[PDB]
Scaffold this active site. Structure first.
Site, mmCIF file in Angstrom:
data_model
loop_
_atom_site.group_PDB
_atom_site.id
_atom_site.type_symbol
_atom_site.label_atom_id
_atom_site.label_comp_id
_atom_site.label_asym_id
_atom_site.label_seq_id
_atom_site.Cartn_x
_atom_site.Cartn_y
_atom_site.Cartn_z
ATOM 1 N N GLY C 43 -13.505 27.966 -30.226
ATOM 2 C CA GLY C 43 -14.548 27.084 -30.723
ATOM 3 C C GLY C 43 -15.838 26.955 -29.918
ATOM 4 O O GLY C 43 -16.380 25.879 -29.840
ATOM 5 N N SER C 44 -16.336 28.034 -29.306
ATOM 6 C CA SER C 44 -17.691 28.065 -28.782
ATOM 7 C C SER C 44 -18.804 28.028 -29.913
ATOM 8 O O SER C 44 -19.933 27.564 -29.706
ATOM 9 C CB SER C 44 -17.839 29.279 -27.895
ATOM 10 O OG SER C 44 -17.678 30.480 -28.651
ATOM 11 N N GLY C 45 -18.451 28.445 -31.127
ATOM 12 C CA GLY C 45 -19.399 28.518 -32.204
ATOM 13 C C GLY C 45 -20.135 29.851 -32.261
ATOM 14 O O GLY C 45 -21.018 29.995 -33.060
ATOM 15 N N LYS C 46 -19.756 30.835 -31.471
ATOM 16 C CA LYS C 46 -20.512 32.154 -31.499
ATOM 17 C C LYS C 46 -20.562 32.929 -32.789
ATOM 18 O O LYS C 46 -21.561 33.572 -33.126
ATOM 19 C CB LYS C 46 -20.012 33.102 -30.420
ATOM 20 C CG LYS C 46 -18.512 33.053 -30.205
ATOM 21 C CD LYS C 46 -17.944 34.192 -29.323
ATOM 22 C CE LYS C 46 -16.390 34.244 -29.455
ATOM 23 N NZ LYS C 46 -15.858 35.262 -28.398
ATOM 24 N N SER C 47 -19.473 32.871 -33.519
ATOM 25 C CA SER C 47 -19.408 33.418 -34.859
ATOM 26 C C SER C 47 -20.340 32.695 -35.894
ATOM 27 O O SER C 47 -20.949 33.301 -36.791
ATOM 28 C CB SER C 47 -17.933 33.260 -35.297
ATOM 29 O OG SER C 47 -17.480 34.385 -35.990
ATOM 30 N N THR C 48 -20.385 31.382 -35.805
ATOM 31 C CA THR C 48 -21.428 30.665 -36.533
ATOM 32 C C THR C 48 -22.783 31.147 -36.155
ATOM 33 O O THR C 48 -23.614 31.309 -36.999
ATOM 34 C CB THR C 48 -21.384 29.171 -36.291
ATOM 35 O OG1 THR C 48 -20.049 28.813 -36.490
ATOM 36 C CG2 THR C 48 -22.358 28.388 -37.316
ATOM 37 N N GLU C 164 -16.298 41.013 -33.495
ATOM 38 C CA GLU C 164 -15.044 41.541 -33.027
ATOM 39 C C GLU C 164 -14.768 42.931 -33.578
ATOM 40 O O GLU C 164 -13.783 43.138 -34.257
ATOM 41 C CB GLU C 164 -13.931 40.585 -33.412
ATOM 42 C CG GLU C 164 -14.105 39.194 -32.920
ATOM 43 C CD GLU C 164 -13.497 38.987 -31.543
ATOM 44 O OE1 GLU C 164 -13.000 39.969 -30.918
ATOM 45 O OE2 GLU C 164 -13.523 37.824 -31.093
#
Lengths: 263, 266, 263, 266, 263, 263, 266
Positions: C43-48, C164
């Site tokens: 849940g770092s939010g990097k994909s967002t 990824e």
């Protein structure tokens, strides 16, 4: 202030799994100085609608025009007086004076509250010196209701909006509250109401709009309403007023001699 | 745009054991403005034919002429808006506006997409202001289908092709879909519908073409179709309509009971 | 295409009970032709964030500038190639040719697909006639991965975004996939990646941004990263590269002679 | 259960152009209690081998003996719990209890599944009361993986096979996964791990088998592996461990820095 | 297996703001070997109902009895075969054999799959050696549909549940699929279906239940259905079957001579 | 009443998208007659925990044992007195007597309220005849707070639970309120409190439990607390009490001579 | 339980400027099984009277006899279930069962509350299995009101008092409410309704008592009421019913149109 609702839709929590549709493509106009009843069953969305006109809710789609102009909530709020049912239950103050004064002190801190208060208290039929220092909570039920109404007209809105003002009221309360509404109309100001008690309020209104599952399904005068709207859930006397109306007379003038079964 | 299909054949997966001849020597004319239903079984080649006409598939043999001219698919893509089955499954966007607007930007990279978007939405019966900030995922089945159509016709191709436009929709979905078809026609533009089931779209077309195992077996008017096509798989209603297309009497619209009373008072 | 993220925040389902914060006040620039790794835990939010740059998500706050201009998703989408993990599992087509061709036929229906396809297949190391008619599903795992990548560069985006790309890949797959990424960079195009496998990918990147609970906590070159970022969860060899770096040499040039414990 | 693989070959899609020889003449013994890593590239045949051992695939040729006996797959299925990759993708249930309990009911149709369910949950480190009414869809990646393992071992097979058990999991997910492997071993039972990447599981196994293009190229201990297997694709850490497996010194556990200091003080 | 639904209600996300009512107080029995159609409009909840009988959903209230016993989902699951629409689109396997075999290998790993497979393939009209090694994806549309059905009867459930098996099917597909359903009934096994195409399926059913906004509003035989149910949305031929029925004959035996307007 | 929390977890809206974890695997015992402080930062879940012990929330997992028995909320509710912050703001009554009497009239309608009221008012230091007829709203802030407390001990619970009783209180209020708590403890009854003001309340407590993101991270006596718990956010005087404690003396007896920097 | 009110007066806030005499010298008999409506303006003392009868308020002067005996309130609380206005505002519980069950536990501390809970739910028309795990907050207005009633009558008092039971409810809410009143009566038990508006409850009661400013001004049957009570504030329908209660004709039920046709055919 002319009010116009133009193609308004509202969906609560739009674009989430808990998205709930309240209104669909609702349009209507309220001319300055009209008294309008908005009616409808369970989940018609009429309360959402009043709140949208009051600027408390930004509708998901469409617009409300104010004197032909679009306006955010914050922009027209000083022009609206809105009360909900049992408004006495929201009294915050220890003296009547402060309860009445709250809206002008909040909305127009740079206008003298004293004369605006006097005038709201008098309009509602509350003698200034006889009530201004009383504890609102120990006013009689009638007096409380008068205080509540004084506190939403003190700032002199163009629009008075009453959501179910009649719930919990006895016949005497109703008559007095609807009396104050007559004087408001007499000033040429607008009033909008919802009230389950269509039969009591129709005598005090010009137009009726009926919502049904978020849709406007009727929009007309009170005459057109009993003449044309679905009479399924009309009370005894509404149904008598209807026949009467159904090409014929204006039963709203009449006083219980009304029995014109005189064939 | 006049379309003429000339001796078109098509084969997938040639030389392999997966080889399938989809189409065999099909010839077909489609004139500006025609309402055409293309029918036949699943695997009769009907979709593959219209994929070719649309310019998505280069055919194994034969040609499609467009106004009489040979064109590679990408030369005429713009003229033909084609909706595949469940075209809503292709959504990328988080709101109705962006999805439809996407389809504007290639053809009109410098133009503000609003006017076109708004005509496309309005065309498919989606009030612009009401839907433009709707999250497509959360719409009804019929409204999704319509947003997908809107994005197919947004640039205003001459020809619309719908692959089985009625599939999966309820009663009102269908009526809304068929309303799009009637409008496109009123405008004088070509619409082609691909459907195995004739009964529920025949009232909305002028002619019927039937494919069987890659071959055209019928090509005529709807009146000719009910008269002359192999009747063996006609629904009951189709058999009544046909019963009374014999010796005369036009069965179309008429009315449903107005149909039956009139049959064996023959 | 210069990319700039300016004060971006994102909250899913903003203004509802299921509102979930993904990013807070994230700013960063990606110059044309840079390869950038975005890293961070759970849940770092990097994909967002990648999805926001890709225009798939309209962020609740702030903006992404494209060549110094603000742009809606729909506007820059033709300029982005984005793949997720196991992209082969999204193959829809029966022939390689159609799988590769899909994006150009969708994005630029009025450009000839044949040469764009040839060129994407060749760039990825797939002979046009030897693969164009094969069934994508029965390609070898390597060949599949090459097809997937061909199908997101066929339309020639300025920006390649890989979420990824390495999950599920063996060492041979990784090397080949990261080879294609080198050729992309050689064209002067931008690549953005997330990959749990920081150790494999750092050798192929220019900069690293680290998110942590929606916040940008690192932004610098790959040299600055191993030198300065928290080395807590650094693998053995990253930690060797660090010492090396920690005033000294560039361990990214070196080949496993790297053991400069030579003191 | 002793497993011995005898001259096993396997071919998919024979005679077709899709033909692939997955396995060629593989022989392998696995004794009760061994911790085995099976490695090689994607497509080396490693999964297909363990699918055969597990009794899911009947092999083209050769045999697997189970305690020395020939068995059809379904005769030994019960003895072998096999988790495929992302075994969580197979969930049907709306709560953790029901999913795991499902796996009890065939073998013990009349038994109350609670005790077994509770041991399986507890085995995979999922406190029973804490998770039993959890909705599997809403769990974390690592917890999902564990519920899926729990339902594989719930009936207590002798052998556990995990296909790439670490894939897609974070740091704590992995530690939790490897904790399951250590427990199963402590119990003296056979565990086989299938993974292309050796570095992150070699510390948890006794021996390594390597497959290349359907053929076994290595079969030895982890100590033998680092010494003798083709080193060309060893990670840097693997090369250090190996550097110091030459002439002696056991690299396993030791410690990470305790590794480096000790290398070229050679 | 006797099935009885006793006072079942279902509310999704009970006790949260996104709580959505699917079924209310639904009761019904399905005797072993009955074919039952469950019908209803948009959001009737019939699909929830089938999933509740299938044990996929634990209903919020009431129970489903299996041979007069209450049973959790996990307990009766091996006894149910359920397919959804376009089941071919969920094929996972490279050979027909594995696609068919999946349910028995999953449900009864200790029974020999080979004979269960042979028998499911033959029942559906697929020659064992001619299909067992084919790639399911390249089967003809008819053959695919037969494979799908084989794969949900292979484990020999007592109950076959088909949610919209007919969507996307041409007349030939429908006839063949409904043929397999006849043979299932001939074994004395139960079948439950939803299908928008009431007109095609009524010829193959014994009873119809109609839901409407979560409520059971009809429950009877197919004869009682066209005789008594609201004929508002009846097709042309259903309406002809109705008149016929409306004291008179059994139009389900008849073959398109059916035109008994013979007065 | 012995209280034991056994492996309690709580997740609000379990199994929906708005599922929010409050507590994880929390166990603890409160012996009859103990005063316990539950502490922790922002979203520790301590308020959920108190509500779980009070029986207002059924926890998703685990149990609370009451005298070694499991008990539903409704079963132990008559045995709990719980107040929240600014409890005066929930006064409903016109006389003190009715405000105090409400819980016994609700919980034990068949016991005489008059003596239970007298006794609660006296315990709190409110003369029965001097306050019983006063209007609760016009009591002084001190007197109000005493009324509030009287109204949650009137029914004689075994357990007094105070959620932030000190917020909004001046030093005099605090001292008096904590005085009443001393007398409660003197009866041998249990008290549980949360209070951001750890420094004021520690002098009145036996044990401290600290939660942190739903987890129990400390459980011990007040001596062990300042000796062993993370002193990061300890006030000046707590930190002085700590040193003192850190092998040495009991700083809770001492009175501001406390400065034993006397080395 | 026979109730007799004897010369009851009541004053709030005596000696203060807030002083209000709520009741003045009220005498009233209520026999086992009677259906009584108590009416008058807001502030006529009607609620305060029934609060006294119920044993919640000890009156300033006079007495209530219960079966002829003097009782302190808490001695007869058990016999009288009283619902205040919006009794749903008193919910504490997270499910319907617990809220109703709460009301069992004092009177029957050792008894399993299920049977009583289930009769109370069923009494108020709430199917037990359908509602028992419903979260009261999420119920409809009418269902909430009914759960609140259920918890008032769960222990089966002889007397039910409802303060303005119809307030705030829709059409079906009201019908459901009045159905509770008809059942309680069918059982032969005493029910008292307190309402300013007579028209919508007069059809469901036997007699009417009217209070004005703390004084009883009417006490008679519904037939006597329409005949003899000050008619000045009668609704139109009440005036018709009364018009035809003069010289005879029972207006009750009858039917609504069957009412009008029959009036001035007088």
């Amino acid at each position: 202030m002319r009010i116009e609702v133009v193609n308004v839709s509202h969906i609560f929590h739009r674009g989430t799994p808990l998205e709930k549709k309240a209104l669909e493509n609702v349009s209507l106009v309220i001319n300055e100085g009209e008294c309008l009843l908005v009616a409808g069953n369970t989940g018609s969305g009429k309360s959402t609608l009043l709140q949208i006109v009051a600027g408390l809710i930004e509708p998901t789609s469409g617009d409300v025009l104010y004197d032909g102009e679009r306006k955010k909530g914050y922009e027209i709020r000083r022009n609206i007086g809105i009360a909900f049912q049992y408004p006495e239950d929201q009294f915050f103050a220890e003296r009547v004076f402060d309860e009445v004064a709250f809206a002008v002190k909040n909305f127009y801190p740079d206008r003298d509250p004293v004369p605006l208060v006097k005038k709201a208290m008098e309009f509602v039929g509350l003698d200034f010196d006889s009530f201004k220092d009383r504890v609102p909570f120990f006013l009689s039920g009638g007096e409380k209701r008068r205080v509540a109404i004084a506190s939403v007209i003190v700032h002199e809105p163009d629009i008075l909006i009453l959501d179910e003002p009649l719930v919990g009221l006895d016949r005497e309360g109703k008559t007095d509250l609807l009396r104050i509404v007559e004087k408001w109309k007499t000033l040429g100001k607008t009033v909008i109401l919802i009230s389950h008690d269509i039969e009591t309020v129709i005598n005090h209104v010009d137009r009726v709009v009926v919502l049904e599952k978020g849709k406007k399904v009727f929009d007309g005068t009170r005459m057109e309403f009993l003449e044309k709207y679905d009479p399924r859930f009309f009370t005894s006397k509404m149904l008598v007023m209807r026949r009467l109306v159904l090409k014929g007379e204006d039963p709203f003038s009449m006083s219980d001699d009304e029995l014109l079964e005189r064939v």
